[PDB]
Amino acid sequence: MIRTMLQGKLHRVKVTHADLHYEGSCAIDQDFLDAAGILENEAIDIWNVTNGKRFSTYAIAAERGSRIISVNGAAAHCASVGDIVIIASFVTMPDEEARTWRPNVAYFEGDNEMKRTA
Amino acid sequence: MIRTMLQGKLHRVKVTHADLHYEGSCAIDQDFLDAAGILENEAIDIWNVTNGKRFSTYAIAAERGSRIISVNGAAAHCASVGDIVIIASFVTMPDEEARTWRPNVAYFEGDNEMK
Amino acid sequence: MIRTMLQGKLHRVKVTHADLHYEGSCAIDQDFLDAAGILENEAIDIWNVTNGKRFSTYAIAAERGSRIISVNGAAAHCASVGDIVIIASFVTMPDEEARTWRPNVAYFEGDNEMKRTA
Amino acid sequence: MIRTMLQGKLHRVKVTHADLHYEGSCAIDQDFLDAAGILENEAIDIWNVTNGKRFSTYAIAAERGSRIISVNGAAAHCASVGDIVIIASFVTMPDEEARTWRPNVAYFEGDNEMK
Numbered sequence A, C: 001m002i003r004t005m006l007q008g009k010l011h012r013v014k015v016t017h018a019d020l021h022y023e024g025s026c027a028i029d030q031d032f033l034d035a036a037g038i039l040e041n042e043a044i045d046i047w048n049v050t051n052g053k054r055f056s057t058y059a060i061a062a063e064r065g066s067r068i069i070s071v072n073g074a075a076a077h078c079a080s081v082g083d084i085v086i087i088a089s090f091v092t093m094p095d096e097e098a099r100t101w102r103p104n105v106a107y108f109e110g111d112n113e114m115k116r117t118a
Numbered sequence B, D: 001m002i003r004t005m006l007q008g009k010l011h012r013v014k015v016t017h018a019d020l021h022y023e024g025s026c027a028i029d030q031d032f033l034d035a036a037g038i039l040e041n042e043a044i045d046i047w048n049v050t051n052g053k054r055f056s057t058y059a060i061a062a063e064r065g066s067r068i069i070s071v072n073g074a075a076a077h078c079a080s081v082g083d084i085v086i087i088a089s090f091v092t093m094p095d096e097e098a099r100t101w102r103p104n105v106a107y108f109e110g111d112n113e114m115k
Helices: A030-036 A095-099 B030-036 B073-077 C030-036 C095-099 D030-036 D073-077
Strands: A002-014 A026-029 A043-048 A054-062 A084-094 A104-109 A113-115 B002-014 B026-029 B043-048 B054-062 B069-071 B084-094 B104-109 C002-014 C026-029 C043-048 C054-062 C084-094 C104-109 C113-115 D002-014 D026-029 D043-048 D054-062 D069-071 D084-094 D104-109
Touching: A002 A030, A002 A095, A002 D043, A026 A030, A030 A054, A030 A104, A030 A113, A043 B002, A043 D073, A084 A095, A084 D073, B002 B030, B002 B069, B026 B030, B030 B054, B030 B104, B043 C002, B054 B069, B073 C043, B073 C084, C002 C030, C002 C095, C026 C030, C030 C054, C030 C104, C030 C113, C043 D002, C084 C095, D002 D030, D002 D069, D026 D030, D030 D054, D030 D104, D054 D069
Parallel strands: A002 A104, A026 A054, B002 B104, B026 B054, C002 C104, C026 C054, D002 D104, D026 D054
Antiparallel strands: A002 A084, A002 D084, A043 A054, A043 A084, A084 B002, A104 A113, B002 B084, B026 B069, B043 B054, B043 B084, B084 C002, C002 C084, C043 C054, C043 C084, C084 D002, C104 C113, D002 D084, D026 D069, D043 D054, D043 D084
16 A cells, blocks of 8 residues: 655645745745655645644645745735745655655744754 | 646636536636646645635536536535636656646736737 | 545435444445435435535445434434435546546435435 | 545644644654555645644654654645544545555554554
8 A cells, every 4th residue: 555655744844935925835045845745736734833724735846945835826825925835745655665654854043044854 | 756746727718607506516628628637536635825725626627618617516615706716637647757747837818828 | 636426325314313432433335325325334424404414435335225324423413313414425536537427316305215316 | 437435534633733844744643544445755645633624644653652743845835733533544445445455544542542
């Protein structure tokens, strides 16, 4: 049988300003995507720690080094600039692989400064 | 391992019909389904830009050229006529393929005119 | 790539009385499960046409011919006796199979009298 | 085709801890995970019998014998200490296997004593 496992997550990133509208997606600095193992166009779950909302959308890449986290445009109702969120992707795999699977986790503080641990 | 990826979407289509008598699906102009790669009987997510509601149902085809987006059944509780929505479907594939995957996106203006 | 397709559904069944508690599941007359192609322990989505609620749980079989549809017990908050619901299961399959896939649909009226069409 | 089936569940466990500072997961006594077949880092659904909320997160192991059910992070918005919940995981498998599939269920009473 096939398990659904946390692939990776961006832990407590902050939603930022962004000039562009992102058409229902969440735009995410490519560096952050790299660290969490998240792909452009991948389904993602976003858990808003500030307001408690939980929603699902898809990831798009923002410019590397922009530190952008944006639901600007069509997804603006579920998060606001300043809100602290967790962004997760989930993958499927056989049970044996699942049993020793290690998610790709990136932790954030401050001005979306990324760390390997908390 | 296997990723879940955006297969395609209809971006900012307008709801044209919303009846609370059968069938719990969203009926979509076949031309629109064709552009977004969405299949009859495929699971779809619908994100209401107008009222913020987010729900899931399945697609059925409406008459080609009709430019209908009809939210039927229980789903009629979650969108009204005139609401702007995004309709999306997701597919799975091996990670290796997902790295180069490109979704099928259709954009709209006015009264469901596809760009 | 792999599609998520409507496997089958019970269209506008009515939630009934039931003496037993069903532990978070929806108990469903085995005859109805047969017609919609739904399995015991299968994940199911329930769309409540009466109150607009949409939730996901799993199916268990009720006695054949009981005509039971019950969320009695731990799932009682999302539907009430008399409410009209649609119960769906979804399966995955390759795109080619998906393109000619036909869901198993059962329609209901009256005292959960089942029909092949509407 | 491939079915989604209940893999296992913890039936009517009580929430023992709920902190809104890391990590967005549900920490569960390893003995409980063992009984229900739920894995560390597995997606789980949580159905709050007490307040009716239904949400999804992932599992992590708590200390064996602790009888802890800890809803952390944003999930702390959806359950409080003393709430009764059901925690479930789902798996996929071919239809042929799904026809004979049996979930792993653990029942509880009192303060998270497994039957």
